[PDB]
Design a protein around this ligand. Structure first.
Ligand SMILES: CC/C(=C(/c1ccc(/C=C/C(=O)O)cc1)c1ccc2n[nH]cc2c1)c1ccc(F)cc1Cl
Ligand SMILES: CC/C(=C(/c1ccc(/C=C/C(=O)O)cc1)c1ccc2n[nH]cc2c1)c1ccc(F)cc1Cl
Ligand SMILES: [Cl-]
Lengths: 246, 244
């Protein structure tokens, strides 16, 4: 692939990723009205709906992503969307121990998780991830690398791949993933970590992604258990949004 | 802030690998000569039976993973509850590597895709497992890398879901993270000795650890299908096997 992505240095990768970051959105409720009146699930659903649109724009700006066919872009987003929302939430919540910062005007604690049956389980997992990032002193530059890894990794092993084209798409993804790895290592070397510390930190970061997958899976199961499914993107919806984007 | 006294942390890379290779469970056989062809119910029976027998050996293996016995029984159980199906699955994928298009559950139970269709929804899981096996094959995964990955799953999968208020709980967690760091070093060591450059080492490490996310996903899907049909070994069972 002549992909410009593969010619990027670590610093250019980080710049591109920092520049692609979506805005922090606000929850939509009247702050003049008391907080009951508001449905918690309604607020969260609405927020996720609005976050999704921005996620598509962000994805299109991840180096290497637009080199893929639309079909593969959709497949990656279908698999990764909730993991991406979740890693964003955890990062925003880092400086708020015991709380989840859904939006600047929607900072929830554990006991607010108990609104909606089974959500507290997810809340606790999210809190623990936020604690882990805090403990590790996760940097914004590392965060954007991890979020891009999720986009590219989560769906890559579930392409139905008979064709030459599909094999080339997979190879491409793996090369970009290798570039993000290099980028992460670079950031750590420049922060003055030893070689051993670099590889240990890389491993600690990537192992957290396993827990993010777990949380996404649990979350998706609770959502599928519902008789309404207002925002969870079908392939076709995602393809439309990708086409509607351009 | 306190660092648990563990012989595990004094092991070199080479000693870690040896200890892990030595702890490997045996390859078990499926219930000998069943009625073939299989029904949906008979296939599930064979797979359930196999998992039950594999579990006992998994506990023995876990007890021999350096650092694992340093933990309290409660924490050992928590790790196994979270990791058990992922461990079965990574074992299966490794055994299946040299059998393209097939899953080697046991030497007398080698199934292909179309045999996955015998139980409703299972082919989806089969396909994910096959794809993982292909990925390991493509990467030329080595047996020494495999044992490191399998131990990482044991230690990592449940580590973030200890409910941890006390200093003691934080020290247990730190211990786990140090052992995980030791296994990372061990993996890097193996790659360096295989003659990979520094860049290649870090890239390969990342490729391997990213597969663990897919293994978590398969475990989750597997558990969901099983709950839809009917499964996590009970705390008490696990405790007994750990005590026994
Ligand atoms: C953990 C929080 C959460 C989010 C969520 C995602 C989708 C929907 C609804 C989809 C639909 O009807 O199609 C509802 C809530 C959430 C909503 C904003 C978010 N912004 N950043 C992260 C965020 C997560 C949630 C809550 C309950 C649950 F059973 C499962 C989940 Cl995942
Ligand atoms: C994919 C294969 C499979 C395994 C399996 C694991 C546990 C149980 C437990 C049931 C119970 O306790 O009542 C049943 C089946 C399997 C059985 C041996 C195995 N050895 N190595 C890997 C292995 C997997 C399976 C099948 C259908 C499904 F819906 C989900 C799964 Cl996970
Ligand atoms: Cl908005």
């Amino acid at each position: 692939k002549n992909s410009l992505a593969l010619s990027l240095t670590a610093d250019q990768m980080v710049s591109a990723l920092l520049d692609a970051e979506p805005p922090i959105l606000y929850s939509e409720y009247d702050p003049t009205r008391p907080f009951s009146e508001a449905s918690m699930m309604g607020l969260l659903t609405n927020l996720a709906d609005r976050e999704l649109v921005h996620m598509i724009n962000w994805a299109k700006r991840v180096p290497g992503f637009v080199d893929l066919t639309s079909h593969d872009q959709v497949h990656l987003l279908e698999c990764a969307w909730l993991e991406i929302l979740m890693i964003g939430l955890v990062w925003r919540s880092m400086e708020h121990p015991g709380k989840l910062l859904f939006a600047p005007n929607l900072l929830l604690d554990r006991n607010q998780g108990k609104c909606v049956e089974g959500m507290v389980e997810i809340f606790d997992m999210l809190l623990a991830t936020s604690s882990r990032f805090r403990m590790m002193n996760l940097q914004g530059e590392e965060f954007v690398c991890l979020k891009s890894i999720i986009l590219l990794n989560s769906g890559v092993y579930t392409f139905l791949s008979s064709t030459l084209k599909s094999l080339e798409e997979k190879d491409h993804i793996h090369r970009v993933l290798d570039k993000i790895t290099d980028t992460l290592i670079h950031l750590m070397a420049k922060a003055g970590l030893t070689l051993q510390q670099q590889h240990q930190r890389l491993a600690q970061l990537l192992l957290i992604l396993s827990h993010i997958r777990h949380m996404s899976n649990k979350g998706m199961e609770h959502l599928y258990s519902m008789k309404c499914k207002n925002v969870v993107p079908s392939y076709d919806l995602l393809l439309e949004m990708l086409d509607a984007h351009r």
